[PDB]
Amino acid sequence: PQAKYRHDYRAPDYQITDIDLTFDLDAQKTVVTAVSQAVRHGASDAPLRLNGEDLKLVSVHINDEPWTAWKEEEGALVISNLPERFTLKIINEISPAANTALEGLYQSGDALCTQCEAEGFRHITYYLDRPDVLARFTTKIIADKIKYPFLLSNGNRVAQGELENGRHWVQWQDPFPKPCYLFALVAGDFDVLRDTFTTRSGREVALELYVDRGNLDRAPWAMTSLKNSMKWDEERFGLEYDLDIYMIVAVDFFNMGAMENKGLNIFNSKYVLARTDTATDKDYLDIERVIGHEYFHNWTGNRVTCRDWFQLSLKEGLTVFRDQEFSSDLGSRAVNRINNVRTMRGLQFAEDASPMAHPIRPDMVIEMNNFYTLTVYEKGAEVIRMIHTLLGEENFQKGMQLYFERHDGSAATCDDFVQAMEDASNVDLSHFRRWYSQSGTPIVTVKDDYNPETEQYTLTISQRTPATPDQAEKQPLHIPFAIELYDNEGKVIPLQKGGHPVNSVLNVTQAEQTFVFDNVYFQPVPALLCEFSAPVKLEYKWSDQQLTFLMRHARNDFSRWDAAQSLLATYIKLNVARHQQGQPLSLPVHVADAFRAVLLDEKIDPALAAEILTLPSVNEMAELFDIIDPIAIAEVREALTRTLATELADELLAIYNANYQSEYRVEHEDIAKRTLRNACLRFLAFGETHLADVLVSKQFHEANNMTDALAALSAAVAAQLPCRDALMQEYDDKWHQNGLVMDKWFILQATSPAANVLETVRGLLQHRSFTMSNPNRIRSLIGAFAGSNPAAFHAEDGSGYLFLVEMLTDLNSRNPQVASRLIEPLIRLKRYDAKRQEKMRAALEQLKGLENLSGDLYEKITKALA
């Protein structure tokens, strides 16, 4: 399988302007008729090269003439000797029931549905399956009326009819030209939640949520969030919906989270279905996020699309930015920012230090489905946020306006977006563009000097990015470096120099530079990289007292949290080294006291307190180290939890009790209180056994919502409490018929600290609620084990790697996209000790030799074994 390269982009030899599709739908054999209106733009002698995968070609006509000048080749139909303008008619067959990869047209339970992004439409017919070919679609669907009473495609219904033998048909038209990755089709029997939204200018939009029969009780929150999304996009970005109907279909079998197909979004059920006894607060807020995200794509992705797939972050970074801004505006901005930073530093930084490292705009791709990444998405969004930091809101919105004015109705590039922002704002982004081309995480080193004779404070700031396996050359970036300086009372020191104010966003553009601030009348405590102003590692020699001071005084809630993270990092590192020497946890009394103070501070937002009291995950901990010791990390996380639980026992119980809420509401103040209460419960679970068991068991049994029930259950597992097995059985017996709810339980089993976790996980391959055919179940049991229990995955006997190999041997053939997600923990081998590397390498070599190795896995394995 051959790499493709961004620098090889060339405009297509042929365009398609209009396509009329007919589907004679059947699970075993679907017949597709595609009539495309084509226009030659290249040389007269160039053939039309269509993409196609696993299609049974029935016929090829050009202007209704059966065509002889064609040939099928690997992945392609190559059609020669064409006129400059013509009608192409292709008839082909496909088999949805055989489609275990869930790409193209496939079966989800009894429904038929599609996934076309990135390159799935070529599994449906022979086409120009590239996103700079935009065509007006019309779609006729013919099927059995009893099995498929709802026949859905993009746009509006233009025709309908009934046929002999129990078949019927519906034809759809979408006026907006689209790339084929935005085509969708759905056929099935659903319950439908129907509502309306009226846009600011008065356009009435029919809203329709399709869910499996019996799931209407779980639909209203996703509908609410849809309307919230539409209102917010009007208020914040001035964007309205552009069609007459907005359809969302929730399907149980889905690889990609959710999908923005124009007017017909298809969602994994996990990001639609919620009710208070099935879904947690985090599920609610994830529904909200993802509903918003797909909606936001209507403009940032659909009305302006991608010229080629190397521009994926043009839509994904921008739309993740939008979903964050939506969440943050409606909910707690500090909690959203904190959690997005946790993702960046724990999960994305790890990718940027891996063999799969790439810039947000990749240069080389073998399988484009491998590049729906933390980098393209989350780092993409940090890059858009840097633009927002550099420009400010008003100028950033001016750039959005210019981007749409220039590019509405077209496929554009990352560079086009940057140019719009630059031209609308007058801010120079020439240097800033390097963020699109350079991979790896920059390291920003800061040293300071206070000169009491001159009352000047000097920051000396250096940057470097280490080489990555994909790029040997690195250069300095344009790093927006936000600061704030605090005097000894906790008040902000005005930034100025030579009599003029200095912006608090420093432009760190060189390998090394100094910034001098005048009229600094007290030695400052600095808050550095405020609100994570650039996606960088920060190296500053903090004293503990500077950090506890920020925890008390910093103006932005994020900075209080970040200071606590910096304070904890020192002691996480200390204690991992101690663990490797067989020594127990050591923690200064003054560090425990800082967290006691957070517990007892009445003035702190409980949302913020909860996050300060949520320890970094094992993934976030790993990124503090060059060589990861996953057992030490897991054991130190536990020991730290236990030490704090002992030292803060009375305070934790008092705050736990103070935040009791008898009514359950999905409201942000209530969510905040519950997150704080359940943060205290995590530590309390690690108190004296008798107290902890009673407290946890009682919360599980008295809970009136799944947030509280799951928090108790998770604490029974994490602390190995006496009540654990009984509560886990109770949950299984109550919820085994509900896969989304059982996913939470598979995750707890997979992440259990119990010594026999792998045996349990293997046994759960036969569980009544588990199936290898469902990506959510795979993710929740197998994925959670490999990715979220690195201590067990990395068991010294190598048993974790052997288990993953067996699962991957199945999934390579069944569903390569899911396989490729799951291999990620194995490709991190160079971060581990030599003996682990040797076992991981042996595992990778075994997979390398699989018969019919997927391109998806090939790309990752070859990078890892290099």
Q: Which residues are annotated as a binding site?
A: 117, 257-261, 293, 297, 316
Contact 613, 560 (CB under 8 A): no
What does the block give as tokens for 820? Answer: 């490729």
Which residue among 294, 422, 623, 824 is the active-site one?
Answer: 294
- For Zn ion, the closer of residues 316 and 620 by Cβ is 316
Stretch of residues binding Zn ion (CB under 5 A), selected from 91-99, 233-241, 308-316, 776-784? 308-316
- For Zn ion, the closer of residues 319 and 389 by Cβ is 319
Q: What is the rounded radius of gyration, in angstroms, for the C-alpha atoms of the chain?
A: 28
Q: Of 421, 530, 437, 446, which is closest to residue 477 (Cα–Cα)?
A: 437
Note whether 732 binds Na ion by CB under 5 A.
Answer: no
Q: How far apart are CA 496 and CA 503, in angstroms?
A: 8
Q: Which of 13, 24, 54, 72 binds Na ion (CB under 5 A)?
A: 72
Contact 309, 335 (CB under 8 A): no
Stretch of residues binding Zn ion (CB under 5 A), selected from 319-327, 434-442, 542-550, 669-677? 319-327
- For Na ion, the closer of residues 162 and 851 by Cβ is 851
Stretch of residues binding Zn ion (CB under 5 A), selected from 225-233, 316-324, 838-846, 848-856? 316-324
Residues contacting residue 312 through CB under 8 Å, at least 6 positions apart: 118, 306, 362, 368, 371, 372, 376
Greatest CA separation for the chain: 96
Q: How far apart are CA 341 and CA 347, in angstroms?
A: 10
Sheet containing 185-188: which strands, arranged edge to edge? 104-108, 111-115, 185-188, 150-153
- For Zn ion, the closer of residues 319 and 659 by Cβ is 319
Bridge partner list, 506: 481
Q: How far apart are CA 230 and CA 637, in angstroms?
A: 42
Bridge partner list, 127: 51
What does the block give as tokens for 709? Answer: 């029930």
What does the block give as tokens for 767? Answer: 């569980």
Considering only residues 759 through 818, tell me which ones interact with Na ion, judged by CB under 5 A: 770, 787, 790
Note whether 134 binds Na ion by CB under 5 A.
Answer: yes
CB of 537 to Na ion, least distance (A): 10
Q: Of 689, 611, 583, which is closest to residue 646 (Cα–Cα)?
A: 689
* Strands of 174-303, DSSP E: 185-188, 190-198, 204-212, 245-251, 258-259, 264-268
- For Zn ion, the closer of residues 22 and 369 by Cβ is 369
Q: Which helix (H) or strand (E) holds 683?
A: helix 668-684
CB of 460 to Na ion, least distance (A): 9
- H, E, C per residue of 360-404: CCCCEECCHHHHCCHHHHHHHHHHHHHHHHHHCHHHHHHHHHHHH
Q: How far apart are CA 133 and CA 122, in angstroms?
A: 13
Note whether 817 binds Zn ion by CB under 5 A.
Answer: no
Q: Which does 800 bind (CB under 5 to 8 A by kind): Zn ion, Na ion, none?
A: none
Contact 30, 96 (CB under 8 A): yes
Q: Which of 99, 375, 619, 749 binds Na ion (CB under 5 A)?
A: 619
Count of residues that bind Na ion according to CB under 5 A: 25
Count of residues that bind Zn ion according to CB under 5 A: 2
Note whether 373 binds Zn ion by CB under 5 A.
Answer: no
Note whether 313 binds Zn ion by CB under 5 A.
Answer: no
Q: How far apart are CA 206 and CA 246, in angstroms?
A: 6
What does the block give as tokens for 448? Answer: 């300071």
Q: Which does 639 bind (CB under 5 to 8 A by kind): Zn ion, Na ion, none?
A: Na ion
Considering only residues 409 through 468, tell me which ones interact with Na ion, judged by CB under 5 A: 428, 430, 448
Q: How far apart are CA 831 and CA 833, in angstroms?
A: 7
Owner of token pair 């994909």: 470
Q: How far apart are CA 131 and CA 49, in angstroms?
A: 15
762: three-class secondary structure by DSSP? helix
Binding residues for substrate: 117, 257-261
What is the residue type of 84?
E
Residues contacting residue 701 through CB under 8 Å, at least 6 positions apart: none
Stretch of residues binding Na ion (CB under 5 A), selected from 208-216, 455-463, 579-587, 775-783? 579-587
Note whether 26 binds Na ion by CB under 5 A.
Answer: no
Give the CB-nearest residue to Zn ion: 319
Q: How far apart are CA 119 and CA 54, in angstroms?
A: 13
What does the block give as tokens for 618? Answer: 């094992």
Note whether 566 binds Zn ion by CB under 5 A.
Answer: no
Stretch of residues binding Zn ion (CB under 5 A), selected from 14-22, 205-213, 309-317, 783-791? 309-317
Going from the C-alpha of 387 to that of each of 202, 235, 419, 660, 739, the distances in angstroms are 33, 20, 11, 42, 41
- For Na ion, the closer of residues 709 and 829 by Cβ is 829
Binding residues for Zn(2+): 293, 297, 316
Half-sphere exposure of 567 (CA within 13 A, CB side): 27
Give the CB-nearest residue to Na ion: 301
Q: Which does 423 bind (CB under 5 to 8 A by kind): Zn ion, Na ion, none?
A: none
Note whether 15 binds Na ion by CB under 5 A.
Answer: yes
- For Zn ion, the closer of residues 316 and 367 by Cβ is 316
Stretch of residues binding Na ion (CB under 5 A), selected from 326-334, 478-486, 593-601, 798-806? 326-334
Q: Which does 643 bind (CB under 5 to 8 A by kind): Zn ion, Na ion, none?
A: Na ion
What does the block give as tokens for 806? Answer: 């067996």
Stretch of residues binding Na ion (CB under 5 A), selected from 65-73, 716-724, 794-802, 832-840? 65-73
- For Zn ion, the closer of residues 288 and 316 by Cβ is 316
Stretch of residues binding Na ion (CB under 5 A), selected from 147-155, 258-266, 596-604, 733-741? 258-266
What does the block give as tokens for 98? Answer: 């055989």
Q: What are phi and psi of 735, to 5 degrees?
A: -120, 5
Q: What are phi and psi of 52, to 5 degrees?
A: -165, 140
Q: Which does 319 bind (CB under 5 to 8 A by kind): Na ion, Zn ion, none?
A: Zn ion
Q: Residues 623-662: x/- map of binding to Na ion (CB under 5 A)?
A: ----------------x--xx-------------------
Q: How far apart are CA 76 and CA 73, in angstroms?
A: 5
CB of 298 to Zn ion, least distance (A): 11
Considering only residues 469 through 498, tell me which ones interact with Na ion, judged by CB under 5 A: none
- For Na ion, the closer of residues 88 and 219 by Cβ is 88
- For Na ion, the closer of residues 227 and 794 by Cβ is 794
Q: Residues 338-357: x/- map of binding to Na ion (CB under 5 A)?
A: ------------x-------
Q: Which does 790 bind (CB under 5 to 8 A by kind): Na ion, Zn ion, none?
A: Na ion
Note whether 319 binds Zn ion by CB under 5 A.
Answer: yes
Contact 752, 717 (CB under 8 A): yes
CB atoms closer than 10 angstroms to residue 257: 15
| Peptide-bond breaks in the chain following residues (C–N over 2.5 A) | none
Q: How far apart are CA 703 and CA 699, in angstroms?
A: 6
- For Zn ion, the closer of residues 118 and 576 by Cβ is 118
Q: Quick check: is 489 catalytic? A: no
Binding residues for Zn ion, per CB under 5 A?
Answer: 316, 319
Q: Which residues are catalytic?
A: 294
Binding residues for Na ion, per CB under 5 A?
Answer: 15, 17-18, 20, 72, 134, 260, 297, 301-302, 333, 350, 367, 428, 430, 448, 585, 619, 622, 639, 642-643, 770, 787, 790
